[PDB]
Design a protein around this ligand. Structure first.
Ligand code: HEM
Ligand SMILES: O=C1N[C@@H](Cc2c[nH]c3c(F)cccc23)C(=O)N2CCC[C@@H]12
Ligand SMILES: [Ca+2]
Length: 391
């Protein structure tokens, strides 16, 4: 009878996650609020590891059209396949995805990424009065990341369209079903017209490397939509949430100011501590399976809340405490197993650049109380409406 998700749109995690984590079962039945579909939900680290590293629990089958699902609408343009990352790896493009997303891409981009974060912070520090870290730092930094490393150079209008399509499509509520679907239609039709054009510009952005490698307009458009939904609301949501975390922990920031070698530990702890998705990664049983004693029938979908797992006290001592340099296991902020986020290198690079830009300038603080922060309600990927801030 428990419906999913739990409407915890701010950084305050729903109490249900601890309730289920403490209950007497390793997986719990829920019902999708948006479709009425029955789903399984995992909240414990030990169980999550087992699930996400068993390839008989399939991601592609859970993303497929017609699957039991937590989203109110299918997350694809009608009539399209909607599984770009599989299609690209199927077309033999793993080596290109590594060149575009891996350590060589980070070496290519980290210089300007850090120059940009400093330039943005410096411009804000030269201003008299208050400013908005969401609109004045995160949005330009994450837009530049998406443009220069993933899509190619976008005009302001094009960026606004894609950002709007992501915010409208990647929702549990707040928009009608047909508005939600049409957001994917608009983005797909944008890339049907513009994906190849974007590839024919200067740069080494991933969509270029995909278009240049040894692909139909429909496949390249699916790649563009993938890069928007995978890179834009995630990075912008996470950077906003990590800034809120840092601004609430001035002692930790002061330690990073004094000991810049401790920033990478703080980046990893932010990935554990700062919640992002309001839903769950999901996988469909491709045959009858058993997880810690509970039978999962072929075709049933099992969900893992990364947020729940990252706050599991059996995994992390004092899980609700922001503690850079804690010595526990790998966080789940990028997932686990074969589908571990391939954007994790660029993500870490932009997070580190943000953490260092903040640590170099102590005194940065919120210009309102944490409870005065307003949150977009119903996004898959949490994001505050604004982060009023000041020195
Ligand atoms: C910055 C650019 C990013 C790109 C290009 C990117 C790309 C991707 C792609 C293509 C996938 C699908 C992999 C698959 O299904 O095999 C993925 C998964 C994932 N990403 Fe990212 N990502 C980015 C940023 C982020 C950030 C900032 C976070 C979190 C802080 C994140 C968290 C995740 C997680 C948890 C998954 C796993 C989903 C699952 O297991 O089903 N990503 N990412
Ligand atoms: O909310 C949602 N999460 C993702 C899974 C996820 C968890 N964390 C993530 C992250 F940080 C980056 C990318 C993805 C995720 C998913 O499958 N969704 C289906 C329907 C609802 C939506
Ligand atoms: Ca079905």
């Amino acid at each position: 009878t428990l419906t999913y998700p739990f409407h915890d749109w701010s950084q305050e995690l729903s109490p249900r996650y601890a309730q289920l984590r403490a209950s007497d079962a390793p997986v719990c039945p829920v019902v999708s609020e948006g479709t009425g579909d029955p789903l399984w939900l995992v909240t414990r680290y030990a169980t999550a590891v087992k699930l996400l590293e068993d390839s008989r629990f399939s991601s592609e089958a859970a993303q497929a059209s017609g699957a039991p699902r937590q989203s109110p609408v299918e997350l694809r343009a009608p009539g399209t396949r909607g599984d770009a990352i599989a299609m690209l790896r199927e077309a033999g493009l793993r080596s290109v995805l590594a060149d575009g997303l891996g350590p060589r891409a980070v070496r290519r981009h980290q210089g300007w990424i850090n120059d940009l974060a400093e330039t943005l912070m410096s411009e804000l520090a030269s201003r008299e009065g208050t400013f908005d870290l969401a609109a004045d730092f995160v949005e330009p930094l994450s837009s530049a990341l998406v443009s220069r490393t993933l899509l190619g150079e976008l005009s302001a209008d094009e960026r606004d369209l894609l950002a709007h399509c992501a915010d409208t499509g990647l929702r549990f509520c707040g928009v009608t079903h047909e508005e939600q679907v049409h957001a994917f239609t608009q983005m797909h039709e944008f890339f049907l017209e513009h994906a190849r054009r974007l590839a024919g510009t200067p740069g080494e952005h991933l969509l270029k490397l995909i278009a240049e490698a040894p692909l139909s307009d429909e496949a390249l458009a699916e790649a563009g939509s993938l890069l928007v939904v995978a890179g834009f609301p995630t990075s912008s949501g996470f950077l906003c949430g990590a800034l809120l975390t840092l601004l609430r922990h001035p002692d930790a920031v002061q330690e990073l100011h004094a000991h810049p070698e401790r920033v990478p530990s703080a980046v990893e702890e932010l990935l554990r501590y700062t919640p992002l998705s309001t839903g769950s990664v999901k996988r469909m049983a491709t045959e009858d399976l058993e997880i810690d004693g509970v039978r999962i029938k072929a075709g049933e979908v099992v969900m893992v809340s990364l947020e729940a797992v990252n706050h599991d006290p059996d995994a992390f001592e004092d899980p609700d405490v922001f503690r850079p340099g804690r010595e526990g296991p790998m966080h789940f902020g990028f997932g686990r197993g074969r589908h571990f986020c391939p954007g994790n290198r660029l993500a870490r690079c932009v997070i580190e650049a943000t953490v260092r830009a903040v640590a170099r300038r102590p005194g940065l603080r919120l210009a309102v109380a944490p409870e005065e922060i307003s949150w977009h309600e119903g996004l898959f990927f949490r994001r505050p409406r604004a982060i009023p801030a000041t020195w």
